[PDB]
Nucleic acid binder design. Structure first.
Lengths: 219, 218, 220, 220
DNA sequence: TTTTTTTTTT
DNA sequence: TTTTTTT
């Protein structure tokens, strides 16, 4: 039987304690109201966990209070008692990069940002293969790295284009008809890929990711 | 003053969907009024994400498993969103490898039930007295200041109140004990750890304010 | 033009105050750290607002402490002081439906739910039109209400079928090739739509919603 | 042994499905990475639950998509399989109050708001009892309803006053020394309680609640 | 086309 | 990647 898991999510090390206490109270809200637990039992349980985590985070790992941690642990509630399974204790740590190292870089970049904000991104492609019914699949790239996929369906004298990229920003190229005879497909894609995505939809990452995988799966 | 887009803590791999969701949440009202369209906002979030990609991946060389926090002011004028890049702020936290943390976490996990039963040793030091004659002590944990304690002398009796922030936020309820005023200082040093063994587990901010309340009286 | 906005989002009326406090501190974190404001200034501002909002909810709106509210208001910071624009004040209210009215319905339904959990989602379709290049687009319905869309591309003895529904649960029909002559498409689609979505992907609502439109826009 | 519980929290009825899917995926992430479950297993589980909830919310409870729902249900993972316990299913519903009924009330209130924002919170008190060491405890009331507590410690011609209120906004009265004779305590408190809290700290509700309970526990 | 909405804080 | 987080 699977056990409930106490998860903090991403939190600044200085505030993990109040995060652990509030999450645990939220999960055991029904248990308290049902009468299986008291508010004292839960607060005491969280306090003991926080007591343990303090030694781990501050002493063993030397985490600064401005660092970021993510903590999770399974726990069991049986017969009016809360018990943690410390074999399930998992702790993630992120160490802070000093402002003196980031602020000047961001400030420098901020001056060049309004130019970059309007520029069209410019992509490159490479043919991946063809389907049984004659669709052509391309890999779409940004700066030599793979960032998306594209599929072209030649039809009665014309072609249909669909695709999506994940980086530098999630874009979805909706089903688009272009003036191309099947003879002109491979040439057209290389000439028009950057231009097609200038009118693409700005979507969420997972939406773009799914389409990329859908298109690449057909090969 | 301008509206600010704030992401909060987010894994670098998912900053884009975070920026998009924050911006849409803030500008829902402008859309329904007809001042903006979903296209207008999505293009705005998309263009910002395009900008942040160069900053995070190339300039800051951030791995996608790191944590970032981004904020920037923006203004909406005549059905368009315009960012003020002078207000752009980016925070970065770099990932500590699992091979450096997991074994340390593993060994401690064996020692956790042992430590959990142990009572939390505190030590104290005299700070001063209040206007009405209360005695204030500074509570220390492993030599470091973590809380405060206040004792109100009576006739053959004393009232004790206090709070600690570390290693876990505790609140010492108003407690009356039978002790003569002459031996209070000895009482505090010998019994402070025993007092907090029956203390309340509270939130950090509650403990913090009580500590400052007690220290402010000096 | 636009002013910063303090937004609570959905919150139980009993806890709106701590929400207003936490949001305002989060938004003015920088102002405090810069020295333009003090922690005292922000706490006092949120407290005064919450005092006012209490009067509105309990007296004017007659909100129960177990109801749900959503509050937003614009504010500006002038000379180390926080000043609200109450003309921008917006308050939404949801009144709780008594447990005595909902619990028996949920309890009754909970008994029949796991059997329903297995059943195939019988769908029906309606032809919407043909695309410029000859794809056929159908509207998918569930219990007479439109819930999704489907597009079919005729081939030589074969067809390509794509689609998505939003209700009763978001499903995505991946690109599927089937054995059917073009004269038989309209018959095939209507006969197999429920069967096709029985093996479809469980996706997010927004994914299904977006796909429906991509398909429906091609006719409209 | 207790089971994991899927909790959505407050969500607009139109967006419950994606809420359920994301919460379930967040809880079962580790199970997926370990290989005990696949993304398909979790997606199918959330999809089946949403299919069931659709009938409950839309058909049985007649919930409008602008309403607010809160859904929770226990589930079990046994041998690479997800199982919901529908006996543990709980659904709360809040029905939306129309803007046409709230906006005029908010707008008129918005006109008197900048005036009210300056105003001090008039309070009343009532004697509850005395402590063992002779402190006097009062119940603080706002609109006839109990909202807080206050404790007075008598000195020689002086007193120490401490207290906290929960409504209309969480306020905590720091340790304050005042000039009052012990017989005139009941009288002093009733004249000054509102004035004392005009300089009290704006805090979170839970801070105030605990101080209130601490003061009341001291009463016999 | 959604039709509701996509945060910060916690 | 993804959440809950005062009756």
């Amino acid at each position: 039987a699977m056990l409930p898991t106490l998860r903090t999510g991403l939190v600044i090390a200085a505030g993990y304690a109040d995060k652990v206490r509030r999450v645990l109270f939220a999960q055991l809200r029904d248990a308290i109201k049902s009468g299986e637990l008291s508010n004292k039992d839960v607060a005491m349980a969280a306090g003991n966990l926080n007591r343990v985590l303090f030694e781990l985070l501050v002493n063993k790992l030397k985490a600064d209070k401005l660092d970021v941690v993510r903590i999770q642990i399974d726990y069991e509630v049986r017969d009016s008692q809360i018990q943690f399974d410390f074999s399930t204790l998992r702790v993630e740590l992120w160490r802070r990069v000093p402002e003196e190292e980031i602020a000047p870089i961001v400030e420098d970049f901020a001056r060049a940002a309004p130019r970059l904000l309007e520029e069209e991104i410019r992509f490159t492609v490479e043919k991946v293969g063809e389907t049984d019914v004659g669709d052509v699949v391309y890999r779409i790239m940004y700066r030599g790295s793979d960032v998306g996929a594209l599929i072209v369906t030649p039809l009665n004298g014309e072609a249909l284009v669909r695709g999506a990229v994940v980086e530098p920003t999630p874009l979805l190229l909706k089903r688009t008809r272009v003036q191309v005879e099947a003879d002109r497909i491979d040439d057209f894609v290389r000439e028009s890929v950057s231009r097609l995505f200038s009118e693409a939809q700005n979507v969420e990452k997972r939406e773009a990711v799914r389409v990329v995988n859908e298109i690449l799966s057909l090969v």
